[PDB]
Amino acid sequence: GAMAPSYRVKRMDIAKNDEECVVNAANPRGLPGDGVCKAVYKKWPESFKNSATPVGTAKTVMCGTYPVIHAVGPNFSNYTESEGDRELAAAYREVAKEVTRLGVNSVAIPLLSTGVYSGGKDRLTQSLNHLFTAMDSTDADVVIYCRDKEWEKKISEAIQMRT
Ligand SMILES: O=C(Nc1nc(=O)cc[nH]1)c1nccs1
Ligand SMILES: [Cl-]
Ligand SMILES: [Cl-]
Numbered sequence: 001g002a003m004a005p006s007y008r009v010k011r012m013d014i015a016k017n018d019e020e021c022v023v024n025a026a027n028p029r030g031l032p033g034d035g036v037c038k039a040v041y042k043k044w045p046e047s048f049k050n051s052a053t054p055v056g057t058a059k060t061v062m063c064g065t066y067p068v069i070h071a072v073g074p075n076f077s078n079y080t081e082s083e084g085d086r087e088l089a090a091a092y093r094e095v096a097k098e099v100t101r102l103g104v105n106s107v108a109i110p111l112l113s114t115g116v117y118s119g120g121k122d123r124l125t126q127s128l129n130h131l132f133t134a135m136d137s138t139d140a141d142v143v144i145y146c147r148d149k150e151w152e153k154k155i156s157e158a159i160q161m162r163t
Pocket of ligand 2: 012013
């Protein structure tokens with residue numbers, strides 16, 4: 001584990017992360033997808049061999065020795081707010097189990113269900129709070145990746161408020 005486990009946020013492409021493993025914001029079918037998923041497919045295509053997994057679950061596939069944890073958040077265009085909220089929390093709990101099993105000291109993670117699966121709603125606080133509920137009990141350094149300047153500021157404020 002990390003000596004003083006922390007949370008940090010960076011505004012850049014998660015395919016350029018400086019962590020020991022990456023979480024992909026995957027689709028259930030293991031397809032190349034869009035946004036973060038397409039960036040992950042271009043950088044670690046080998047990790048999409050048998051990566052299909054249901055909504056609310058995570059499945060890790062190695063690219064060489066580098067772990068890619070495919071986490072499938074719900075698409076809020078298809079799910080109700082109550083059911084989608086439950087599956088989003090579940091996907092993050094499965095990421096925490098995989099990060100612990102892998103024994104890594106750091107992990108790069110995007111905010112699940114905040115892009116094309118958001119159903120057109122701002123889900124920064126919802127998704128980040130489920131990330132903290134799952135990852136708080138792990139001892140890996142967590143680095144959250146985002147692309148929007150206003151989101152970077154809001155995620156950074158949420159991390160600093162708890163310290
Ligand atoms: O690209 C994104 N998510 C996503 N992409 C897919 O193709 C299928 C499911 N989820 C994200 N970008 C930023 C935060 S999540
Ligand atoms: Cl970049
Ligand atoms: Cl973003």
